[PDB]
């Protein structure tokens, strides 16, 4: 279901309030731990000696209820950034007391406001609290999309509003957030709870916000429109924003009062359910990727180490890739063998890295549909995959297939091959040393041979995301350089991220490389225009390959192949996030170095701010060979 909660600041009694909230269908209640108007002093003699309890005891609720049902709010009167020293000190003490009490109750989350530009002292106090003892209470910063000063009506004679576009002035709230999390050092325990408000900002602002670590979304009851039947509803822009947020699995918090008094408060929540359902159901790719989103995993290196049976099994779950390979084989066979030669002309076909044999089955079925005679040489280095291939070959496979247990770079083929087929493509174009292996295999390819993998190109696109940056930072491990985690690429299903520009081609390889001096070292430079102030965090990498002619496998978002869930995009992080302004151009450079018995990438962003070369000499990441 869609996790929904209720925001109340007047809770006369917890038991009845929770009963009513649960009856209405909400999942959690956001309440003040202390009475909002109960000011407390800590440095004035008559006041600091106030007798009696300071708040209702925790015995009122079961420990489970506190840990799951309640969300604490900070008292409104606390202003840690006040200009008055006494008020500032009192606010600091009160905020520390409230946070400590929230930790004592073990609240799952605590809601703090960011209603003003300057929040340095608040950030300092919160950071000090985080680095003190052990507790797991998350912190949600309430940040309006539109600043309060900009949402006020034009009622003042001497302080009129302005209708200027203020393209840079619509982002100010985000700045408030961006500074705050910067002060707290991108702490993983700080998240946003943005407030929608009545009017939405420019679509670019919303797109930028969606890249931040949003955990909750505050919906005032005043933004809901009234339909002809008197029920609450949302405008089209609000509905689109709600759909996008739902795609992020955010927690909705309804706040305010029941303006539609004729109906019940639950009418609001019901509407969200109506939006929860009827939304575009997840496609095959989305269902496949469910459970692996923003989860960093190291790329495979089949050349160095042998894969497991489960890896090959999951490779087989994708039918699109093998259908495309079969189509390419069919076209190549038709083109090479004319009808008059359909018999007495056997085309020698080679499958390199046959794995468990799906490629061999695809080739055989392509030959059968093309009605042409062929002979295969299945080459596989993985001895266990060789065992599986041999067992599959003894039965259900005639003498056509000839399983070979050797590395194609070392195998000495008895006969030249008309065609060679391979699937060494990784998340990046050549992440698994496809160029080296294919160059090695080229020696036994006929003069007019065809390489079904054909051509493949890699694409890079700058991306900003605090979630991925925090995750990669958390990937730091002992027994190695503390910055190593930032100098290796990760295969990740980019979900909570913002793309700063369209992808551009990085590297291109084609086979066979009949030209002399076959070298795979490469150097590329890419310039990306930027249309919004942002914080670049890394570079997403995709690939697009042309198999034979007119047959392509693509994962770049603009031309992603349908249902192609075999490859996730790759991520190249940069250890220092780079602040970028509107109109600037991000200039980055990539090196592919292939020193003997070793291969690795090196990347560095040169504009608008230079960064250290990442992974020099493959000190942090290498592909092995």
């Amino acid at each position: 279901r869609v996790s929904s909660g209720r925001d109340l600041n007047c809770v006369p009694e917890i038991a009845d309030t929770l009963g009513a909230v649960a009856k209405q269908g909400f999942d959690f209640l956001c309440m003040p731990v202390f009475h909002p108007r109960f000011k407390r002093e800590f440095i004035q003699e008559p006041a600091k000696n106030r007798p009696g309890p300071q708040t209702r005891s925790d015995l009122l609720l079961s420990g489970r209820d506190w840990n799951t049902l309640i969300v604490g709010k900070l008292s409104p009167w606390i202003r840690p950034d006040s200009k008055v020293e006494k008020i500032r000190r009192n606010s600091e003490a009160a905020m520390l007391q409230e946070l400590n009490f929230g930790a004592y109750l073990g609240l799952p989350a605590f809601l703090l406001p960011l209603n003003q530009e300057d929040n340095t002292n608040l950030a300092r106090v919160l950071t000090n609290h985080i680095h003190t003892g052990h507790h797991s209470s998350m912190f949600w910063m309430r940040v309006p999309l539109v600043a309060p000063e900009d949402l006020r009506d034009d009622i003042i004679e001497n302080a009129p509003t302005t209708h200027t576009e203020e393209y840079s002035g619509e982002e100010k709230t985000w700045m408030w957030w961006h500074n705050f999390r910067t002060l707290c050092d991108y702490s993983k325990r700080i998240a946003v709870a943005l407030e929608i408000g009545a009017d939405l900002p420019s679509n670019h602002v919303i797109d930028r916000w969606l890249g931040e670590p949003i955990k909750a979304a505050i919906l005032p009851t005043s933004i809901f429109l009234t339909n002809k039947k008197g029920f609450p509803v949302l405008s089209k822009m609000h509905q689109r924003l709600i759909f996008r947020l739902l795609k992020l699995e955010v927690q909705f918090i309804i706040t305010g009062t029941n303006h539609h008094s004729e109906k019940e408060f639950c009418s609001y929540l019901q509407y969200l359910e109506y939006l929860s359902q009827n939304r575009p159901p997840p496609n095959a790719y989305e269902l496949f990727a469910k459970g692996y989103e923003d989860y960093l995993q190291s790329p495979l290196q089949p050349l160095m180490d042998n894969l497991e049976s489960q890896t090959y099994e999951v490779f087989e779950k994708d039918p699109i890739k093998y259908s495309q390979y079969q189509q390419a084989i069919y076209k190549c066979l038709l083109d090479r063998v004319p009808e008059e030669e359909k018999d007495t002309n056997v085309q020698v076909l080679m499958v390199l890295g046959a794995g468990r044999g799906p490629l061999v089955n695809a080739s055989l079925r392509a030959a059968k549909q093309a009605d042409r005679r062929i002979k295969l040489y299945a080459v596989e280095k993985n001895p266990n995959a060789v065992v599986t291939l041999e067992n599959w070959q003894f039965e259900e496979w005639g003498s056509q297939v000839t399983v070979v247990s050797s590395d194609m770079r070392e195998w000495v083929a008895p006969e030249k091959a008309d065609i060679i087929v391979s699937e060494l493509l990784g998340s990046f174009a050549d992440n698994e040393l496809s160029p080296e292996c294919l160059d090695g295999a080229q020696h036994f390819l006929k003069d007019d041979g065809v390489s079904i993998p054909g051509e493949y190109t890699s694409f890079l696109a700058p991306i900003s995301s605090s979630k991925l940056y925090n995750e990669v930072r958390a990937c730091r491990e002992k027994d190695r350089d503390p910055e190593a985690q930032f100098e290796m690429p990760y295969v990740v299903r980019l979900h909570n991220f913002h793309q700063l520009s369209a992808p551009q081609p990085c590297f291109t390889f084609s086979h066979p490389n009949r030209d002399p001096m076959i070298d795979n070292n490469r150097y590329c430079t890419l310039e990306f225009p930027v249309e919004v102030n942002t914080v670049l965090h890394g570079f997403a990498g995709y690939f697009e390959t042309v198999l034979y002619q007119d047959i392509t496998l693509s994962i770049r978002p603009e031309t992603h192949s349908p249902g192609m869930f075999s490859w996730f995009p790759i991520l190249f992080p940069i250890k220092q996030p780079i602040t970028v302004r509107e109109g600037q151009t991000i200039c980055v450079r990539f090196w592919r170095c292939s020193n003997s018995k070793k291969v690795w990438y090196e990347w560095a962003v040169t504009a608008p701010v230079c960064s250290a070369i990442h992974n020099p000499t493959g000190r942090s990441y290498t592909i092995g060979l």
């Binding site: 429109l225 009234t226 339909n227 002809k228 039947k229 029920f231 509803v233 089209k236 019901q270 509407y271 109506y274």
Partner: peptide
């Protein structure tokens, strides 16, 4: 419940 309860406001 009500028919068109969630229909958009015009």
């Amino acid at each position: 419940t009500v028919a068109g309860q969630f229909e958009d406001a015009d």
